[PDB]
Design a protein around this ligand. Structure first.
Ligand SMILES: *C(=O)C1=CN[C@@H](C(=O)O)C(C)(C)S1
Ligand SMILES: [Co+2]
Ligand SMILES: [Co+2]
Ligand SMILES: [Co+2]
Ligand SMILES: [Co+2]
Length: 466
């Protein structure tokens, strides 16, 4: 039954979509350690978001499944008779799920400590990580988009998916020839708006563009929205995630009857502050739960935040250089041979990253041995599951096949890069596989990856639903 499996994958790999592409494809039985298939498993390839496998495993090793992230509000002394403080610091220590609701709850805590007036200025302290907002080789033209948000220790997560450093931009049409109505979301009052969008005729062509031009904190809206088109939302990044947290916290304070008299900006707690008075704090959920939004939807901000957090744990340095080194050590200490691994980031966004299929499968096997194995494998997208928090980036792939509800796998995708790596459990074998494709010049080779995942599901002992 091995040869038939081998002949089938071979044939799948002949596909025209893989013309001039380099593909690493390795399949292994995790129980018997049997090698089932191996094509170019030592070839170094861009993994895209398959990099998160290495990041998540390292984060579980260094921080632990039980780890949580904190955010504080400090003043130099507690409020007095008159409920006054001077300057106020909002302090982020790497929470990637900190919401506007959580800012409100802390705002209510500030007020309940008996503060009525912030007489000085409000500061947003993100000094727990360094101020390097973006990886060196990330593309400036990708900067307006969510997967490319700036990295900070203090950042507001939008939605149940916890997309960091972004605002939700809405555009609603009016009558033909009148401007579109635009809303900036959280960044109303923080980012600038440049609205040039108009309402087009009903049944005309939608040509709306929402941008944030490079090096600006301006949301620029161009084009035309047809009078009958559905109202639109788009997540766009802001310059300085923490100064947005600052602005939003100013809003939550006032909502909770605390007047801010001064300004809002970035700044770190002074250090001539003798004994800061913590007036509010928040504690995230634990890493094991945070892994879900992070791995299902392949959340880039989360990955980089987790890397800088590794750095802080291992070295007191909230930094890509320290974290990445700690990612390798943790993988090493886990029994992973890291010879083929090149780490330029945690998310896989960077074109500086390199893996091999063997390294991936190596990681996949070594994780199952660890204490945190169940929580790790739970975070992985499940093929063909329509609940986004189950299927993740696999929700609309492999539906109505043997892989539906079985294949647990991480996706990864860029121009000329596509990867699918993970697990296929079954009565006929518990399988680990990695499929990494580079250099294809046509459609994304997802039909090839699916076709292999489905065939593996059949090997593991599952049936197509009918
Ligand atoms: C990994 O390949 C990806 C990361 N998160 C998103 C992004 O746009 O970068 C994805 C679309 C899932 S690709
Ligand atoms: Co810990
Ligand atoms: Co939303
Ligand atoms: Co505002
Ligand atoms: Co089944």
């Amino acid at each position: 039954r091995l040869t038939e499996l081998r002949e089938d994958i071979d044939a799948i790999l002949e596909d025209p979509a893989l013309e001039g592409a380099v593909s690493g494809v390795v399949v292994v039985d995790t129980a018997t350690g049997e090698e089932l298939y191996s094509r170019d498993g030592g070839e170094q390839l861009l993994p895209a978001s398959n990099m998160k496998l290495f990041t998540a495993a390292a984060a579980l090793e260094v921080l632990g499944a039980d780890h949580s992230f904190g955010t504080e509000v400090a003043a130099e002394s507690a409020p007095g008779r008159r409920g006054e403080v001077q300057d106020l610091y909002l302090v982020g220590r790497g929470d990637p799920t900190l919401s506007a609701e959580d800012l409100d709850a802390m705002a209510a805590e500030v007020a309940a400590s008996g503060v009525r007036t912030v007489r000085g200025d409000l500061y947003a302290d993100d000094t727990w990580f360094d101020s390097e907002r973006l990886v060196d080789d990330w593309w400036p033209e990708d900067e307006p988009y969510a997967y490319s948000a700036q990295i900070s220790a203090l950042t507001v997560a939008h939605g149940e998916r916890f997309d960091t450093g972004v605002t939700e931009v809405s555009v609603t049409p009016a009558a033909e020839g009148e401007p579109a109505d635009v809303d900036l979301g959280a960044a109303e009052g923080y980012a600038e708006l440049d609205n040039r969008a108009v309402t087009g005729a009903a049944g005309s062509a939608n040509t709306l563009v929402i941008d944030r031009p490079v090096g600006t904190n301006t949301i620029a809206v161009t084009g035309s929205l047809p009078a009958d088109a559905a109202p639109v939302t788009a997540l766009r990044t802001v310059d300085e995630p923490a100064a947005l947290a600052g602005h939003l916290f100013e809003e939550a304070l006032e909502s909770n009857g605390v007047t801010v008299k001064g300004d809002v900006g970035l700044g770190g707690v002074p250090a001539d502050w003798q004994d800061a008075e913590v007036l509010a704090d928040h504690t995230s959920a634990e890493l094991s739960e945070i892994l879900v939004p992070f791995m299902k939807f392949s959340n880039n901000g989360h990955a980089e935040m987790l890397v800088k957090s590794i750095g802080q744990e291992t070295a007191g340095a909230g930094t890509w250089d320290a974290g990445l080194v700690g990612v390798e050590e943790a993988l090493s200490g886990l029994g992973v041979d890291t010879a083929g691994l090149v780490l330029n980031d945690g998310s896989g966004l960077s074109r500086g990253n390199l893996v091999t299929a063997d390294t991936v499968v190596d990681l996949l096997g070594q994780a199952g041995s660890a204490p945190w194995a169940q929580t790790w494998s739970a975070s992985l997208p499940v093929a063909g599951e329509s609940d986004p928090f189950v299927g993740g980036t696999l929700a609309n792939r492999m539906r109505g096949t043997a892989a539906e509800g079985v294949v647990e796998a991480k996706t990864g995708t860029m121009s000329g890069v596509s990867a699918l790596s993970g697990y296929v459990p079954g009565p006929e074998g518990e399988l680990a596989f990695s499929i990494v494709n580079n250099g294809h010049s046509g459609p994304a080779p997802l039909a090839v990856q699916d076709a292999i995942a489905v065939r593996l599901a059949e090997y593991a002992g599952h049936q197509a639903p009918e």
